[PDB]
Structure 1
Amino acid sequence: NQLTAYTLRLGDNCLVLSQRLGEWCGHAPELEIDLALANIGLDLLGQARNFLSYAAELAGEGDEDTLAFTRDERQFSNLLLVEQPNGNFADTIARQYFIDAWHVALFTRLMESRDPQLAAISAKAIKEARYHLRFSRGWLERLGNGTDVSGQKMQQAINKLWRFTAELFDADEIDIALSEEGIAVDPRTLRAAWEAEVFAGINEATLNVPQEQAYRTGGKKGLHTEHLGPMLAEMQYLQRVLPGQQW
């Protein structure tokens, strides 16, 4: 159960973020970005399928689809950071950065997990994550150390997502007890590696690591922002109208 809970958190992170990038398809600044974005989303969706497929297995019931489509917002355990609106291009970049940096740190260490499947999944995943971090860092420098306008939008994109970064290092009873068994990675130990990457990246962008203390948690226990309910309605619509079918 605790292990299931955890798998789901990781899997829901990827799935939700996946959905967000789906919306950019066709709408990006240039084609290369469109293609870059489609691809990141497909990796993430891929990651989501493996975590959820495992979860479904620990549970002994359902599958990646039942978990993705027959749970409501009070059951989804994604990070609040992944559900935030795409906004303008700098908004999407900022979120992807904070996330890939986190994924890089996390999956680097999760390939060590004493649960083989988790380790197996993170081993595939870290390969992709490093490509994503290259991409999201790529644009952070480009927009902060770019034109006055762009540096400015980028500074603000970062300011407005910042309060959510608190949840990446929040550890709860499930993170602790599974981490003592060396199955999980204590989110608290991830702080160091994340800050080292991000703090550097922002300052190299000639921008400012925000002074304000972060405080937003809850996503992991089903208490989400007001943005998820509408995503789940768009994502699940068909499965809800026509449940129990093959596609």
Structure 2
Amino acid sequence: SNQLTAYTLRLGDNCLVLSQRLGEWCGHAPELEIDLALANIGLDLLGQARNFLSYAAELAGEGDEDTLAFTRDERQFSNLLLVEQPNGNFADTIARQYFIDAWHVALFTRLMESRDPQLAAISAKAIKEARYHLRFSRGWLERLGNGTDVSGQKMQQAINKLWRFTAELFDADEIDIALSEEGIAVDPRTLRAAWEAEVFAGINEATLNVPQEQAYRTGGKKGLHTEHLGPMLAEMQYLQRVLPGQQW
């Protein structure tokens, strides 16, 4: 029950932290339509976070999505390092989104066959949304990489700059593996082929290059984060820390 709780929480944290990042874009986008789109994706992901976290709280027998989001520190948060990367420029946001969406699509497709009924249901909802997210993120990857000389370079730079964090997408620990043998979790290593087939084709079609750097960064799932997470949480949790245990 501990493993399942940690696993569920990881999926929640990914969606929560990425949602936070997308929230920062509100009203700062290149076009009103992109503002709308980014807020929509932010909203979907937050919905998924609430679902996963609610289930994790139910699994642990105490707390709720709010105790989990607002009362854990950065050593307890278990999101992928990828979703905590700063927004940077629009290419950086698009690269981060495309990598995550391609991964969400591959994951939720398989996790909807989970022997855990709540995980299956949550994933059935999430997959429909991730498909929308992937169309938009892949769409922009192609528009920017095969846009101008200048947008092509920014998109290549964005891909290069995030690549090292992709290793965590296929990192398996004993929680993953144990839950996967019970037919409950998806073994992240077996996601590589689908993610690579999608991402390599998208990068090619955008007239861009797959980085040759072997990706090497992991630790998010274990609460070992980049220096980005702490200030994110300081901002996200402030009011709850000041005024704990209230209804809002």
Asked if Structure 1 and Structure 2 have the same fold, meaning a TM-score greater than 0.5 normalized by the shorter chain, the answer is yes
Q: TM-score normalised by the shorter chain: which range applies? A: over 0.9
Counterpart position of 1:167: 168
**Cα distance, 1:111 vs. partner?**
0.3
Equivalents in 1 of 2:203, 2:119: separation in Å? 31
**Cα distance, 1:243 vs. partner?**
0.1
Equivalents in 2 of 1:79, 1:165: separation in Å? 9
**Cα distance, 1:125 vs. partner?**
0.3
Equivalents in 2 of 1:111, 1:100: separation in Å? 16
User: Which contiguous aligned blocks of 4+ residues in structure 1 show a shift greater than 2 angstroms?
Assistant: none
Equivalents in 2 of 1:37, 1:217: separation in Å? 26
What do the CA deviations read for 1:91-133 (whole angstroms, capped 9, x no partner)?
Answer: 0000000000000000000000000000000000000000000
Equivalents in 2 of 1:2, 1:18: separation in Å? 24
What do the CA deviations read for 1:187-222 (whole angstroms, capped 9, x no partner)?
Answer: 000000000000000000000000010000000000
What do the CA deviations read for 1:125-178 (whole angstroms, capped 9, x no partner)?
Answer: 000000000000010000000000000000000000000000000000100000
**Secondary structure in 2 aligned to 1:208?**
coil
**Secondary structure in 1 aligned to 2:63?**
coil
Equivalents in 2 of 1:160, 1:63: separation in Å? 35
Q: TM-score, normalised by structure 2?
A: 0.99
Equivalents in 1 of 2:215, 2:51: separation in Å? 31
**Secondary structure in 2 aligned to 1:85?**
coil
Equivalents in 1 of 2:27, 2:215: separation in Å? 34
Counterpart position of 1:232: 233
Equivalents in 2 of 1:157, 1:111: separation in Å? 31
Structure 2 residue runs of 5 or longer lacking an equivalent are none
**Cα distance, 1:235 vs. partner?**
0.1
Structure 1 residue runs of 5 or longer lacking an equivalent are none
**Secondary structure in 1 aligned to 2:99?**
helix
Equivalents in 2 of 1:59, 1:85: separation in Å? 31
Equivalents in 2 of 1:198, 1:33: separation in Å? 22
Equivalents in 1 of 2:213, 2:16: separation in Å? 29
